[PDB]
Amino acid sequence: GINPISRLAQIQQAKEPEYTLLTPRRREFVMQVKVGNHTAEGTGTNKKVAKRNAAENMLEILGFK
Amino acid sequence: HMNKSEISQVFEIALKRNLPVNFEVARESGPPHMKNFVTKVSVGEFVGEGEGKSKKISKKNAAIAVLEELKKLPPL
Amino acid sequence: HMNKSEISQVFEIALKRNLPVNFEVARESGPPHMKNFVTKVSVGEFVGEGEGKSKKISKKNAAIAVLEELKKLPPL
RNA sequence: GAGGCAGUUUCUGGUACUC
RNA sequence: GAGUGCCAGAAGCUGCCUC
């Protein structure tokens, strides 16, 4: 119910998530998530939606939404 | 002083109720010098859509459309 | 119609002269209540530091420090 | 008072595509 | 001259969290 990227921050406070940035006529951004347990990716038309997709793809790998 | 953006209103109503929120740009139309954007958004089960000459605008109009359909739920 | 911040200025000057820019927070120093932030910035060979009770403040000052040195250069 | 995340309004610089 | 996208930066405002 919170916004996807704060929920990851406020969900890994049981045990601080880490992000990094990766490399057409419709070019794209791709950002990665590093929570230790696993690593997720995410793409979007700008940097902003690429980091919200990257989050909501690791809240899907942890089974929340 | 400054009013709240409809987008921000939506985001906070949805935190108060643990509803999942997802704005997305449906599609783009027209030549680059006359683009038309459309954003569809879901707040749990409710939906709105907006159009505009820019991404900012269409998003706002989408937020508005949902605020009309969120004025019907019960308060706290 | 707002003014240009010293921090914003540095980036414009550096871009015109193709110089790399990096602001970084050196550290937080002092007791938990009187903690003071120090940030230093490197614009090529030029360097400036700045200090403040908040990050944004100290960044501003660091920008002021380099900005004086970048007034010592030829405007060709 | 300080930090973080998000949202947003205004403004600045740069750039790409198009008229 | 104009439109839109994208990157960077600043100021303001809102929400949530931590100290």
Author numbering:
A (entry chain C): 284 to 298, 302 to 309, 314 to 355
B (entry chain A), C (entry chain B): 180 to 255
Give the exact sentences the study uses for this entry.
To understand how Stau recognizes its target RNAs, we determined the crystal structure of the minimal RNA-binding region of hStau1, consisting of dsRBDs 3 and 4, in complex with the 19 bp SBS from ARF1 mRNA.
The structure, at 2.9 Å resolution, shows that the tandem dsRBDs of hStau1 recognize A-form RNA, mainly through electrostatic interactions with the RNA backbone. A difference Fourier map, calculated using phases from a derivative complex containing SeMet-substituted hStau1 dsRBD3-4, showed peaks at the expected Met positions in all three domains (M181 and M213 for dsRBD3, and M321 and M348 for dsRBD4). DsRBD3B is bound on the opposite side of the RNA molecule, in an antiparallel orientation to dsRBD3A, whereas the second dsRBD4 is missing and likely to be unbound and disordered, possibly because of steric clashes with the other bound dsRBDs. DsRBD3A and dsRBD4 bind to the RNA next to each other, sharing a heterodimerization interface of 273 Å2 (5.1% of their total surface) (calculated with PISA; Krissinel & Henrick, 2007), which engages strand β1 of dsRBD3A and helix α2 of dsRBD4. Conversely, dsRBD4 primarily uses regions 1 and 3 for binding, whereas the β1–β2 loop in region 2 is partially unstructured and does not engage in close interactions with the RNA. Within the β1–β2 loop of dsRBD3A, the backbone oxygen of P211 establishes a base-specific contact with the N2 group of G77; the same loop is reoriented in dsRBD3B and points toward the minor groove of the symmetry-related RNA molecule without engaging in base-directed contacts, whereas in dsRBD4, the β1–β2 loop is not in close contact with the minor groove.
